[PDB]
Design a protein around this ligand. Structure first.
Ligand SMILES: [Mg+2]
Ligand SMILES: [Mg+2]
Ligand code: NI
Length: 84
């Protein structure tokens, strides 16, 4: 199905933003280890600490996560993400 997640460089949806509708083995490339807030628009997404879907991961469905820390995810750590 259609899935969409928006990731942001700074807390409270500030800074550079990327609007993804497909899997991101490099979290784009720009926001690797810079993701600080997230809006999941549709679908369940898995977020990984290392590129190419490696290491610890955390799953999120639709929601506005104004800080990843609040969602139990380490700040500036997400390095890839994909739909699950
Ligand atoms: Mg950041
Ligand atoms: Mg990382
Ligand atoms: Ni900035």
């Amino acid at each position: 199905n259609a899935a969409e997640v928006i990731v942001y460089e700074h807390v409270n949806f500030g800074g550079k933003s990327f609007d993804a509708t497909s899997d991101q083995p490099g979290a784009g490339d720009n926001l690797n280890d810079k993701i600080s807030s997230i809006k999941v628009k549709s679908g369940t997404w898995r977020f990984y600490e290392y590129i190419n879907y490696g290491g610890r991961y955390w799953d999120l469905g639709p929601g506005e996560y104004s800080s990843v820390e609040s969602a139990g995810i380490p700040d500036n750590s997400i390095s890839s993400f994909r739909q699950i």
